[PDB]
Design an enzyme around this catalytic site. Sequence first.
Site, PDB file in Angstrom:
ATOM      1  CG  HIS A 122      21.859  30.646  38.170  1.00 36.59           C
ATOM      2  ND1 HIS A 122      21.911  31.924  38.284  1.00 36.59           N
ATOM      3  CD2 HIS A 122      23.019  29.970  38.284  1.00 36.59           C
ATOM      4  CE1 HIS A 122      23.689  32.739  38.855  1.00 36.59           C
ATOM      5  NE2 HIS A 122      23.674  30.776  39.288  1.00 36.59           N
TER       6      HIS A 122
ATOM      7  CG  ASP B 165      19.546  23.512  43.085  1.00 38.05           C
ATOM      8  OD1 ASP B 165      19.563  22.307  43.243  1.00 38.05           O
ATOM      9  OD2 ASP B 165      20.211  24.692  42.753  1.00 38.05           O
TER      10      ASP B 165
ATOM     11  CG  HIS C 194      22.178  28.975  42.077  1.00 40.62           C
ATOM     12  ND1 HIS C 194      21.147  28.560  42.412  1.00 40.62           N
ATOM     13  CD2 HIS C 194      22.853  27.916  42.249  1.00 40.62           C
ATOM     14  CE1 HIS C 194      20.039  26.995  42.557  1.00 40.62           C
ATOM     15  NE2 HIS C 194      21.893  26.280  42.356  1.00 40.62           N
TER      16      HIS C 194
ATOM     17  CD  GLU D 261      25.019  24.430  44.165  1.00 44.50           C
ATOM     18  OE1 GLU D 261      24.080  25.049  43.268  1.00 44.50           O
ATOM     19  OE2 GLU D 261      25.299  22.468  43.744  1.00 44.50           O
TER      20      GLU D 261
ATOM     21  CD  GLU E 102      22.477  22.606  45.232  1.00 46.65           C
ATOM     22  OE1 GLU E 102      22.229  23.165  44.635  1.00 46.65           O
ATOM     23  OE2 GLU E 102      22.211  21.441  44.388  1.00 46.65           O
TER      24      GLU E 102
ATOM     25  CG  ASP F  90      21.486  18.841  42.270  1.00 47.30           C
ATOM     26  OD1 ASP F  90      21.110  19.164  42.768  1.00 47.30           O
ATOM     27  OD2 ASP F  90      22.573  19.789  42.639  1.00 47.30           O
TER      28      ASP F  90
HETATM   29  C1  LIG Z   1      25.801  30.169  36.396  1.00 47.59           C
HETATM   30  O1  LIG Z   1      25.063  29.000  35.244  1.00 47.59           O
HETATM   31  C2  LIG Z   1      23.974  29.018  35.168  1.00 47.59           C
HETATM   32  C3  LIG Z   1      23.212  30.590  34.746  1.00 47.59           C
HETATM   33  C4  LIG Z   1      22.070  31.009  34.804  1.00 47.59           C
HETATM   34  C5  LIG Z   1      21.346  29.501  34.022  1.00 47.59           C
HETATM   35  C6  LIG Z   1      21.456  28.795  34.954  1.00 47.59           C
HETATM   36  C7  LIG Z   1      22.646  28.464  34.986  1.00 47.59           C
HETATM   37  C8  LIG Z   1      22.836  26.818  35.067  1.00 47.59           C
HETATM   38  O2  LIG Z   1      24.458  26.008  35.289  1.00 47.59           O
HETATM   39  O3  LIG Z   1      22.054  26.089  35.336  1.00 47.59           O
HETATM   40  C9  LIG Z   1      22.128  24.531  35.875  1.00 47.59           C
HETATM   41  C10 LIG Z   1      20.937  24.263  35.636  1.00 47.59           C
HETATM   42  C11 LIG Z   1      20.066  24.218  34.770  1.00 47.59           C
HETATM   43  C12 LIG Z   1      20.421  22.402  33.804  1.00 47.59           C
HETATM   44  C13 LIG Z   1      19.850  21.868  35.661  1.00 47.59           C
HETATM   45  N1  LIG Z   1      20.938  22.970  36.252  1.00 47.59           N
HETATM   46  C14 LIG Z   1      20.757  22.387  37.188  1.00 47.59           C
HETATM   47  C15 LIG Z   1      20.793  21.054  38.057  1.00 47.59           C
HETATM   48  C16 LIG Z   1      21.120  20.706  39.780  1.00 47.59           C
HETATM   49  N2  LIG Z   1      20.953  21.616  40.539  1.00 47.59           N
HETATM   50  C17 LIG Z   1      21.557  23.369  39.778  1.00 47.59           C
HETATM   51  N3  LIG Z   1      20.994  24.092  40.451  1.00 47.59           N
HETATM   52  C18 LIG Z   1      21.529  25.336  39.592  1.00 47.59           C
HETATM   53  N4  LIG Z   1      21.699  25.041  38.562  1.00 47.59           N
HETATM   54  N5  LIG Z   1      21.043  23.492  38.921  1.00 47.59           N
HETATM   55 MN   LIG Z   2      22.262  24.776  42.419  1.00 47.48          MN
HETATM   56 MN   LIG Z   3      21.572  21.302  42.559  1.00 45.50          MN
END
Ligand SMILES: COc1ccccc1C(=O)OC[C@H]1CCCN1c1ccnc2ncnn12
Ligand SMILES: [Mn+2]
Ligand SMILES: [Mn+2]
Length: 362
Positions: free
Chosen positions: A230, A153, A222, A248, A343, A142
């Site tokens: 996000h 993403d 998201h 995803e 995804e 990912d």
């Molecule tokens: C509900 O979880 C959230 C709520 C608010 C803000 C962030 C998150 C959250 O979980 O953010 C995660 C992000 C930050 C670190 C890496 N990560 C990744 C990596 C790869 N694909 C991704 N798709 C979505 N996030 N994401």
């Molecule tokens: Mn994602």
């Molecule tokens: Mn992702």
Amino acid sequence: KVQTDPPSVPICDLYPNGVFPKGQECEYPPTQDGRTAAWRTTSEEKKALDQASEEIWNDFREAAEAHRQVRKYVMSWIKPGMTMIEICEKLEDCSRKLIKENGLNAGLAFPTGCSLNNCAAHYTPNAGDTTVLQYDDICKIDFGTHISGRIIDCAFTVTFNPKYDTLLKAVKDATNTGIKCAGIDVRLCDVGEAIQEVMESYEVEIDGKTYQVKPIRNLNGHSIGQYRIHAGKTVPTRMEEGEVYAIETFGSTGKGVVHDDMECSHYMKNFDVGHVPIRLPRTKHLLNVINENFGTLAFCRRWLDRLGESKYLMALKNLCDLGIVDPYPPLCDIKGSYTAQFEHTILLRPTCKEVVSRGDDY
Ligand SMILES: COc1ccccc1C(=O)OC[C@H]1CCCN1c1ccnc2ncnn12
Ligand SMILES: [Mn+2]
Ligand SMILES: [Mn+2]
């Protein structure tokens, strides 16, 4: 100007006119009443609104083309025997070259996830991690690219043992079903329900044990915003014109719920935190490094190491404790379970739905 093997030419240089390939373009699904939404394709006002944002879609498309070329390359060489660090560094070196990394204007949107087995998301190795990819591993790649904070993403699952083939099929089908269901004015809950129904229609057998595939209920698609992976809407309210979503799904042979586990590698500034004066020198310096190099994009410890930072762990803990930075530890199902992910990023354009990250691969 053609792409090299291994890829090294920036996507920018492959397309002289500054116009990048569109992804898969789809009519929106019929509305709840049964009438088609195809009128959007031919509407003069929707066409005008769409064109008014052409610059933006074109940025996503550039980032998606980098993503396609990087992942095709990765699939050609990823093999058991490689360390997880080796895999992430070889992928990221290619991504930086093809995206033509330039500070916060073009670059990597977030760290390379390569989560293994029962771990579903947010694992990337830290320095000194000796983990080696195994023949029986199920690995979720990912990774993200961006141009001007327009984020792709997009993720797929790597295996070497055919025993996981039906698990992979189930998740791919569920993700594609989610993408098909998505649309302007569609309730986020209805996309989620469609995903669950498809994923649970699959039964799999792995090493003599049978399972009905479970969607991971706390790992969701998201909305995506500028420099904001996000953006606040989750795919468990309606989707709106002009929004961008990561659709995803994660399938699991475990409990279908993830928990925080293992060492944390991933971190990201809280998007809603403003300027906070800091006097503590190592903490102040680290925040400055983060602001200059990542802004509100996610980063990992390896990316601090490569910038020549050291002895920063206490400083990083301080930023987490102050609420300026949030930690994102690996999210794992129960020991012995298997998880898979697919995804894509989709653009809800005024005229159509574009699976901007679609390729010939998935
Ligand atoms: C509900 O979880 C959230 C709520 C608010 C803000 C962030 C998150 C959250 O979980 O953010 C995660 C992000 C930050 C670190 C890496 N990560 C990744 C990596 C790869 N694909 C991704 N798709 C979505 N996030 N994401
Ligand atoms: Mn994602
Ligand atoms: Mn992702």
